């Protein structure tokens, strides 16, 4: 996206400084561990699309009078932006261990690299630690300092709670607990808060917008947005052309609590529920195709197509009603970019 | 200890409130995960001696004029005390995963309990999250609020760095990297900071003692103390009568970077180093006894006995020189209790 593609180069260049600062030796004793930290950051914070991190910068630009966007201010925006990317990094290193994943972004998951293993648990925590070190270094003197600390801490809590909810929901194959109230709730805590609310809110705080009604309004928009994109993500998992997407979907084999399956569960006859119990989770693809064919049989696409349309109207309506005092274009810019 | 045994009952009773607060449902959607959180706290924060947590309370009593030790103040001290215990809990859940431990306090490690597994990684992070939730709830309006947030965050960073250092130092059997500079450094980051500096410093902050020279002095004492007790702990591992201690030592089988082995390495002839390479790490006890007998051969006890004596004089000297403006008895009280 133009506004995101504009900001990107300078953002990703800043990562050099991030690492320099975080690894910079009045204490020689810890050199080796600091070396290890460099390895961990380089491997794990680098390679994504950086949509979350960039949203901090784009929003900051949109939210501050340009007279007050000096050298120092953007440094800070880049830093706070990278703080989000470290939070994501923390989450994914650990998620990959917990899920017993192999690949992450088409490359070997860190914990699987020869000689890392469960040491990766410590590594994940180091990534999280780095957030607060960066906040102290670049923002301790700023009025929004405490607000960001609390915002990040809270964002972690909410995600971990959501991860708990997901882990409870999807151990052992049981669809009885794959409700829509429960799906809506996993998505909200585990992805929407830190993926959609956090980056904008850090920018709002950075720009002196600290009021609770302001934040509540931003949140209301951003969470419903987050819900939409996860549902989209779940749709495209099975039906998206993977050359378009990037992912090759495995939510059926993985036994994940997908939007698709929740909907399928509200619609299936007792006969079909049995067919679902029969096929959801297996490696072998003859079973996997029996799930997709069931969904298709239930015209779940049309259900989705319907969901999208309703959702478009709801979202635009919320932005109308709740974006100001912020510019509509922070919301729209992000939507543009995540779609 | 009288001063610790005095404070204990009320402390441990407070844990009921901790849990009530941390699990208390305008959102019914997350009930199940909150339930899980209760299970995690109950299992993991309970059962230790609580020396770290209690040190916050004892020190608070020692450090505040009693006119200013109202109902509310102690609530807060209990809470901050429990924050330390949660930090320890976070560390140990994760350490046990990383070390592939079975038992912790003579009971099954959490991650080994049927149905937890690597979900424990999330659980560990929840324990850490709880620290900042408690700090917000009980101390957001207090002047020391930010100081404690930063103190806890920093304490986590230092420990994780130390854990990195330990993981690098003791993968694969190699004594070449078991130096004394390196031992002294692991102990400092991984145990001394959060076990000795953190609890006193939280109390200092709580009592309005925020100055850097004040804290630097406390730190100087408390780190050297921490070094002493870890070395003691390493000694008693092999030589302590385990009915006295509580632990049955396995630092030789576990291949840990013990004080004992570092010293043994500075003393061994090329002949004996070979005997050490020969026996350090094995399950079988004929090998394990060949290590103990080597240490004995090197009169490592007398070396230790010597270390203790020197260390006593050094510590008392530091307290003389650096305790005031604080009462000597916060240092001494703690020493009394950890020995
Ligand atoms: O296919 P994945 O990408 O692995 C997906 N997971 C997620 N997706 C988008 N955001 C988050 S945030 C998240 C997460 C958060 C916290 C943690 C653990 C607690 C911690 F941070 F240590 C682990 C994973 C997972 C997670 P799935 O597991 O639902 O299949
Ligand atoms: O490929 P597309 O042209 O994008 C088509 N998409 C749609 N088709 C019919 N109605 C809607 S409404 C819609 C939409 C809804 C919400 C949003 C984002 C959340 C928001 F409102 F911010 C963006 C686009 C897409 C959409 P397909 O992807 O289903 O093939
Ligand atoms: O024939 P098409 O136009 O390609 C049709 N698509 C749509 N139909 C009716 N409304 C919308 S709105 C929409 C859309 C809206 C927003 C966006 C991005 C977020 C934004 F507004 F910037 C992308 C696609 C597509 C879309 P289909 O392929 O589903 O048959
Ligand atoms: O015999 P153990 O008790 O397991 C001993 N370990 C420790 N001892 C006293 N304090 C700490 S603090 C600590 C630690 C800190 C951080 C972590 C990981 C980073 C995290 F918190 F996730 C794991 C363990 C271990 C640790 P050992 O592993 O040296 O044998
Ligand atoms: O059983 P014990 O009587 O305690 C005997 N202990 C000692 N023996 C000869 N010198 C010293 S000097 C000493 C000592 C040193 C430092 C400290 C703590 C660190 C401090 F200074 F705060 C406490 C006691 C113990 C100590 P043992 O345990 O070796 O059998
Ligand atoms: O014949 P013992 O007295 O039992 C002799 N022990 C000691 N010898 C010379 N200084 C100290 S100082 C000391 C000691 C000091 C402090 C403490 C706790 C920390 C305190 F000061 F409160 C415990 C023991 C023991 C101790 P041993 O058993 O090593 O032969």
From Swiss-Prot, chains A, B:
Metabolic or biological pathway: Isoprenoid biosynthesis; farnesyl diphosphate biosynthesis; farnesyl diphosphate from geranyl diphosphate and isopentenyl diphosphate: step 1/1; Isoprenoid biosynthesis; geranyl diphosphate biosynthesis; geranyl diphosphate from dimethylallyl diphosphate and isopentenyl diphosphate: step 1/1
Keywords: Acetylation, Cholesterol biosynthesis, Cholesterol metabolism, Cytoplasm, Disease variant, Host-virus interaction, Hydroxylation, Isoprene biosynthesis, Lipid biosynthesis, Lipid metabolism, Magnesium, Metal-binding, Steroid biosynthesis, Steroid metabolism, Sterol biosynthesis, Sterol metabolism, Transferase
Compartments reported by the entry: Cytoplasm
Gene Ontology CC terms, in alphabetical order: cytoplasm; cytosol; mitochondrial matrix; nucleoplasm; peroxisome
GO terms, molecular function: (2E,6E)-farnesyl diphosphate synthase activity; dimethylallyltranstransferase activity; metal ion binding; RNA binding
UniProt binding sites for dimethylallyl diphosphate: 104, 190-191, 230, 247, 256
Residues holding isopentenyl diphosphate: 49, 52, 88, 105
Catalysis performed (reactions): isopentenyl diphosphate + dimethylallyl diphosphate = (2E)-geranyl diphosphate + diphosphate; isopentenyl diphosphate + (2E)-geranyl diphosphate = (2E,6E)-farnesyl diphosphate + diphosphate
UniProt keyword annotation of Acetylation present: yes
Family: Belongs to the FPP/GGPP synthase family.
Protein name: Farnesyl pyrophosphate synthase
Organism name: Homo sapiens
Upper classification of the organism: Eukaryota, Metazoa, Chordata, Craniata, Vertebrata
Gene name, Swiss-Prot/TrEMBL: FDPS
């Amino acid at each position: 996206s133009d506004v995101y593609a504009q900001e990107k180069q300078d953002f990703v260049q800043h990562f050099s400084q991030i690492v320099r600062v975080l690894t910079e030796m009045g204490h020689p004793e810890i050199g080796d561990a600091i070396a290890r930290l460099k390895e961990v950051l380089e491997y794990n914070a680098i390679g994504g699309k950086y949509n979350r991190g960039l949203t901090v910068v784009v929003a900051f630009r949109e939210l501050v009078e340009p007279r007050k966007q000096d050298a120092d201010s953007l440094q800070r925006a880049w830093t706070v932006g990278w703080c989000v990317e470290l939070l994501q990094a923390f989450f994914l290193v650990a998620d990959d261990i917990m899920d017993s994943s192999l690949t992450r972004r088409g490359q070997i998951c860190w914990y699987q690299k020869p000689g890392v293993g469960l040491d990766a648990i410590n590594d994940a925590n180091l990534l999280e630690a780095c957030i607060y070190r960066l906040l102290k270094l670049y923002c301790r003197e700023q009025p929004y300092y405490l607000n960001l600390i609390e915002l990040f801490l809270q964002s972690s809590y909410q995600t971990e709670i959501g991860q708990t909810l997901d882990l409870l929901t999807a151990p052992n194959v049981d669809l009885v607990r794959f409700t829509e109230k429960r799906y809506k709730s996993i998505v909200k805590y585990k992805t929407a808060f830190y993926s959609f609310y956090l980056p904008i809110a850090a920018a709002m705080y950075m720009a002196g917008i600290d009021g609770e009604k302001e934040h509540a309004n931003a949140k209301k928009i951003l969470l419903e947005m987050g819900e939409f994109f996860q549902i989209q993500d779940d749709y495209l998992d099975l039906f998206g052309d993977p050359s378009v997407t990037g992912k090759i979907g495995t939510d059926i084999q993985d036994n994940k609590c997908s939007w698709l399956v929740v909907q399928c569960l509200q619609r299936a006859t007792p006969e079909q529920y049995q067919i679902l119990k029969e096929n959801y989770g297996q490696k072998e693809a003859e079973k996997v195709a029996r799930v997709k064919a069931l969904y298709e049989e239930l015209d779940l696409p049309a259900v989705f197509l319907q969901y999208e349309e309703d959702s478009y109207s709801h979202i635009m309506a919320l932005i109308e009603q709740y974006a100001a005092p912020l510019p509509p274009a922070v919301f729209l810019g992000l939507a543009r970019k995540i779609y």
